């Protein structure tokens, strides 16, 4: 079992490496840079999840669906980031359900 003395695994790091590899295989990323980027992803996860929670409650829904994630994303991300994120979210859900 995972004991307190053992370093915490970084949730997204192996996937962040894979994403980097996909686009630019000749560029690496240092351990400290990975830790910083991993923390950004954790931060954004939490901001979106929290806003989706509040939207579900506000709209009298017991379930957080892709619809609440979408609107939370639009409330949290600025401008063009929001637009592209929404596109990618929408595209993934469609492909998933197909």
């Amino acid at each position: 079992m995972k004991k307190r003395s053992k370093a915490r695994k970084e949730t997204y790091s192996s996937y962040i490496y894979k994403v980097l590899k996909q686009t630019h295989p000749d560029t690496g990323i240092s351990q400290k840079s990975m830790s910083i980027l991993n923390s950004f992803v954790n931060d954004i996860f939490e901001r979106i999840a929290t806003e989706a929670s509040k939207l579900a409650a506000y709209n009298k829904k017991s379930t957080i669906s892709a619809r609440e994630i979408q609107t939370a994303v639009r409330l949290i991300l600025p401008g063009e980031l929001a637009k592209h994120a929404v596109s990618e979210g929408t595209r993934a859900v469609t492909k998933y359900s197909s």
């Binding site: 990323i29 929290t50 949290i76």
Partner: protein, 86 residues
Amino acid sequence: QSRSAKAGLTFPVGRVHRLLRRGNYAQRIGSGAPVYLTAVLEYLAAEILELAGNAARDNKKTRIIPRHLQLAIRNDDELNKLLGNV
């Protein structure tokens, strides 16, 4: 076939679903929600990696170090607004 593969994603849908369920953000999590959120996180990671990678390559380097990240984020208005400063 994993849910990530089903959705065309590299980031982990299952892990994100468990994080959602375990955070008790609502009584229930719809099956589409972790797929959507995973895609969004992967997208943001990809954006940051692209710009940090640019900064590294502009610096004639082949490994992203924290100053490349810091500069990438600072120099992008929207990421700077989103992520403050590193």
